[PDB]
Design a protein around this ligand. Structure first.
Ligand SMILES: Cc1cn([C@H]2C[C@H](OP(=O)(O)O)[C@@H](COP(=O)(O)O)O2)c(=O)[nH]c1=O
Ligand SMILES: [Ca+2]
Length: 130
């Protein structure tokens, strides 16, 4: 896998962001995670985390996995990095997303995120507090 420049249009919520990819405004969905919907518990916190992480970054990058690059909804499927730190991983590590939607075609960072989730669970953070 290889990283490439991400041109940010706007943050959307915990696990989606709007990028301009090859000159097309495009929703990107974070691979291997699930943040709460904005209206659900930890939803506003997940949204705020992803938003500030991507916005405050000097270097924003997108990394496709080996399989499907878009889902059935036309959304890009990628890992997103902010100054070298993976947003997908940071959400899981902080208890603001569950590892989810694990498809064998696009699962390169599964073990990494499962490691992060086990630590969030141990620490009883956010989603794992109840
Ligand atoms: C993360 C991810 C979601 N999806 C699909 C599965 C869900 O479809 P269904 O709607 O048919 O269940 C939906 C969940 O996205 P959201 O969590 O953004 O709603 O997006 C993929 O197809 N591939 C993926 O990698
Ligand atoms: Ca979601």
């Amino acid at each position: 896998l290889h990283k490439e420049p991400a041109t940010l249009i706007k943050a959307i919520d915990g696990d989606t962001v709007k990028l301009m990819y090859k000159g097309q405004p495009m929703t990107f969905r974070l691979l291997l995670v699930d943040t709460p919907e904005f209206n659900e518990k930890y939803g506003p916190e997940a949204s705020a985390f992803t938003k500030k992480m991507v916005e405050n970054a000097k270097k924003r990058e997108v990394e496709f996995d080996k399989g499907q690059r878009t889902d059935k909804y036309g959304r890009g499927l990628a890992y997103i990095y902010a100054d070298g730190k993976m947003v997908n991983e940071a959400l899981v590590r902080q208890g603001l997303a569950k590892v989810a939607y694990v498809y064998k075609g696009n699962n390169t960072h599964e073990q990494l995120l499962r490691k992060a989730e086990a630590q969030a669970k141990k620490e009883k953070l956010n989603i794992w507090s109840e």
